[PDB]
């Protein structure tokens, strides 16, 4: 697989259509739509058999995906704000849940 932080065996899922989160106010809705292109659209994960429940799979998927995305982008000079991070966490988690149930189809 791919290597993140000196550990191999990570899987990279196929590009995904980023969801449209409604946050409860027009400003954050608009900020997200205008900035989501700077956020991941594919998630790093490890095979489901390495976990015992969905939450731990997704926690790893979100943590690693955002960590590796920050490294790669900060090579291109990009810099994520406190609200970029909050919005990335929400979108990446949604994609990780979708990835989980997609991987789950093989195990049953």
């Amino acid at each position, epitope marked *: 697989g791919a290597v*993140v*932080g*000196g*550990l191999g*065996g990570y899987m990279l899922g196929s590009a995904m259509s980023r969801p449209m989160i409604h946050f409860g106010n027009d400003w954050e809705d608009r900020y997200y739509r205008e900035n989501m292109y700077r956020y991941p659209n594919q998630v790093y994960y*490890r*095979p489901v058999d*390495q*976990y*015992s*429940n969905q*939450n*731990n*799979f997704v*926690h*790893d998927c979100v*943590n*690693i995906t955002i*960590k590796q995305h920050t490294v790669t982008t900060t090579t291109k000079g990009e810099n994520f704000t406190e609200t970029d991070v909050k919005m990335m966490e929400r979108v990446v988690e949604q994609m990780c849940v979708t990835q989980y149930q997609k991987e789950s189809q093989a195990y049953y």
Partner: nanobody, 124 residues
Framework: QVQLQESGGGLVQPGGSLRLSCAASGRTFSSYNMGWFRQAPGKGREFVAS????????DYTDSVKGRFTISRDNAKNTMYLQMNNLKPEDTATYYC?????????????????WGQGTQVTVSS
């Protein structure tokens, strides 16, 4: 290479406490992240808790948060798991392991050098 040995398991009443210990041979203990897994009868190893090489950051599975506390003494080449408010379903074989890479994760594949394990039985 380095060898890990768990100790401290035993029988405890529900609500009781136990302190598990993970002792490492060698001299590179403090350079690696460390974690704890457990395996209940008829199930596989599941993540319990982890801690960075320096101890600045830690992670816990949802079922043990607020009851278990991970820590380490880099001078004694030892990591600890303090378990309070134990439950019958905390019964399991508990393993310690050495993190692979620089990021503590919850996957089984994030760790190697698994110790032989110690038995924890929570019953009255």
């Amino acid at each position: 290479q380095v060898q890990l040995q768990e100790s401290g398991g035993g029988l405890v009443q529900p609500g009781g406490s136990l302190r598990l210990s993970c002792a490492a041979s060698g001299r590179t203990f403090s350079s690696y992240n460390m974690g704890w897994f457990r395996q209940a009868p008829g199930k596989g190893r599941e993540f319990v808790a982890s801690i960075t090489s320096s101890g600045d950051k830690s992670d816990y599975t949802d079922s043990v948060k607020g009851r278990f506390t991970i820590s380490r003494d880099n001078a004694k080449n030892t990591m600890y798991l303090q378990m309070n408010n134990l439950k019958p379903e905390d019964t399991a074989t508990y393993y310690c392991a050495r993190g692979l890479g620089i990021y503590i994760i919850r996957a089984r594949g994030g760790y190697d050098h698994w110790g032989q394990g110690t038995q924890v039985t929570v019953s009255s």
